[PDB]
Amino acid sequence: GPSQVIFNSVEKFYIPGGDVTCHYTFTQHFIPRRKDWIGIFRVGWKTTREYYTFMWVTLPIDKQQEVQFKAYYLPKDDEYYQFCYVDEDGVVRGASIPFQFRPENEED
Amino acid sequence: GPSQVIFNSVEKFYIPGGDVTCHYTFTQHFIPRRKDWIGIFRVGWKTTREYYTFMWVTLPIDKQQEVQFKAYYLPKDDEYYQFCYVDEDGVVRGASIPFQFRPENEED
């Protein structure tokens, strides 16, 4: 079904070694739950158990939301990744555009 | 460490269906932050993610502080609860005496 969690301001590349802020908003009828989470997943991931790293959904919740991924936990390779919001039932409720962890280049 | 947020005038029981005013004061060197909050937690809570309900810390801040919990959001059972002040880093900076939501009784 349609995404119930929308990622905003997602970059196409993030600087290696920097912390990354992930911005998201809940759609009108969506009810977030305390064990929901956001993963960073390699594009083409098969199951939610494959996340590279994750953060639990930011609490408390009443509006812009954000969660911070610390540099230590971010990918070091050149593969493509996305954010995915996974609810307590294991259902993906939102997914972002793909990005890499790399410096800016001329093709950008 | 020692509490940096002190709850005052906390009752041992609050009337079911009434709004509850939570009174607190900041200790001298404490610096409140805009995403700090006060939760109502069941006694014996393990993580700050377990709050029953919450309010963001009252703003603006310059002294007595207070925040109002609306009746709709309060517990309906007979369990024991407390207020806890949680800062932006997830650290508990103050905690109140325990209370229930119930009428006065003879044991009181």
Side-chain angles (χ1 to χ4, degrees), chain A residues 1-62 64-103 105, chain B residues 1-62 64-103 105:
Chain A
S3 298
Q4 298 183 290
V5 176
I6 306 297
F7 292 100
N8 70 79
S9 307
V10 176
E11 304 176 38
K12 293 177 182 174
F13 59 98
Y14 291 102
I15 318 161
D19 292 337
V20 170
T21 303
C22 168
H23 304 265
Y24 57 101
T25 63
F26 302 127
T27 61
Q28 161 168 29
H29 305 290
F30 184 64
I31 303 179
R33 291 177 281 175
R34 312 287 178 91
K35 303 183 177 183
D36 293 356
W37 52 280
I38 296 159
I40 293 175
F41 283 89
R42 187 172 152 180
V43 165
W45 63 272
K46 302 184 178 184
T47 80
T48 56
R49 300 185 65 85
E50 297 172 13
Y51 61 89
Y52 191 91
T53 190
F54 82 99
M55 285 291 285
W56 298 108
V57 67
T58 293
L59 292 181
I61 293 163
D62 281 319
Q64 278 282 21
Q65 306 294 306
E66 60 189 78
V67 68
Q68 186 177 225
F69 290 89
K70 296 296 297 185
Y72 177 88
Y73 296 108
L74 300 174
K76 314 292 189 283
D77 64 23
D78 59 6
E79 301 295 337
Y80 288 79
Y81 297 86
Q82 62 181 163
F83 298 119
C84 300
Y85 186 109
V86 182
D87 74 16
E88 282 188 356
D89 295 312
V91 181
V92 173
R93 300 297 183 180
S96 76
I97 62 170
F99 44 82
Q100 292 167 288
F101 296 85
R102 62 168 175 78
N105 64 43
Chain B
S3 298
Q4 298 183 290
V5 176
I6 306 297
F7 292 100
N8 70 79
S9 307
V10 176
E11 304 176 38
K12 293 177 182 174
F13 59 98
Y14 291 102
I15 318 161
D19 292 337
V20 170
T21 303
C22 168
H23 304 265
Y24 57 101
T25 63
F26 302 127
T27 61
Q28 161 168 29
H29 305 290
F30 184 64
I31 303 179
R33 291 177 281 175
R34 312 287 178 91
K35 303 183 177 183
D36 293 356
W37 52 280
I38 296 159
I40 293 175
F41 283 89
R42 187 172 152 180
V43 165
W45 63 272
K46 302 184 178 184
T47 80
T48 56
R49 300 185 65 85
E50 297 172 13
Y51 61 89
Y52 191 91
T53 190
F54 82 99
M55 285 291 285
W56 298 108
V57 67
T58 293
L59 292 181
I61 293 163
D62 281 319
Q64 278 282 21
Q65 306 294 306
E66 60 189 78
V67 68
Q68 186 177 225
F69 290 89
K70 296 296 297 185
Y72 177 88
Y73 296 108
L74 300 174
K76 314 292 189 283
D77 64 23
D78 59 6
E79 301 295 337
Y80 288 79
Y81 297 86
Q82 62 181 163
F83 298 119
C84 300
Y85 186 109
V86 182
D87 74 16
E88 282 188 356
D89 295 312
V91 181
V92 173
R93 300 297 183 180
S96 76
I97 62 170
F99 44 82
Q100 292 167 288
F101 296 85
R102 62 168 175 78
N105 64 43

